[PDB]
C-alpha cells in the first residue's frame, strides 16, 4: 500500500 493523502500532497504542493 501507499497513502493517497501522502502522494497527492506532494503532487499538489511541488515546486
Amino acid at each position, epitope marked *: 500500500p*501507499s497513502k*493517497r*493523502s501522502f*502522494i*497527492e*500532497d506532494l*503532487l*499538489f*504542493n511541488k515546486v
Partner: antibody
Amino acid sequence: QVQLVQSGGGVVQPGRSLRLSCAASGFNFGDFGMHWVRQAPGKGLEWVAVISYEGRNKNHADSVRGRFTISRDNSRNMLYLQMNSLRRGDTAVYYCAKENRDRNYDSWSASYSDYYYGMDVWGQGTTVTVSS
Amino acid sequence: DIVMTQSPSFLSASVGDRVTITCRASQGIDRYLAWYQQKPGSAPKLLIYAASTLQSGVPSRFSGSGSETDFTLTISSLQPDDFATYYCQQLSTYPTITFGQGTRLEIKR
C-alpha cells in the same frame, strides 16, 4: 447513470460574484478529483480549476487565481465554483467535469489510474454573462 | 505554462475520407495527452487518453499516436457524426492543465 447536473449561472455585473453548483450521482463522488472548464462565446476550452477527492488540495488557472475558489461537499455530492471579482472576460459557458480513471484499474492507483487521463463525464454547462 | 498548438485550425473533408489533426507541446509531456470532440451546444466528449488508448464507447475509427512533443489524432473513415471541433489537452503538469486551441472539421462540398 454516471452524471453531473449543473445549476446557478446567469447575468451579473462586473465586480460582483456568483456561485456555480454541480450535483454528481451514479458514482462514488468522493473517490475522484473534479474540475471546472469554461468556454467563452465562439472560443476554445480553457481549464479553470481542480480539487482533490477530499477537498484538501486544489489548484486554479492563472487567469482566475485569487478570484475563483473551487470547493466540494462530499456529504451532498456537490461541487462548487465561487466566482468573485467578475470581469467581462469571465463571460463563458462553465462545465464541471469528473476526473477519468484509467480503464485497467477499478480503484485508485495513484498516477497509474488517476490525474493524467482526462475527464470522462461532464455537466451540461452553465452560462455566465458578466456585463454592465 | 505548457502551450499546446493544434494544426490545422480548420479543415474540410468528405464522408469516407481520412483526417489527421496534430497537436504540439511547447515541451515534453511524455504521453499524458487527451483528445476531445465537441459539437455546438454540447459538452466535450473524451475520445482518447494517454495519447493512444481509446475511451470506452468511442468508435475504433479514432486513433491517437505520438509522444514527448508531437501528437496526432486520426479518423480513418469519416462519418456524418464526426464533423465537430476537436481539442487536445495535456495533463503532464498536473495539477495545472492546458488545452489546445481546437480544430474545426467541416464538410467538404
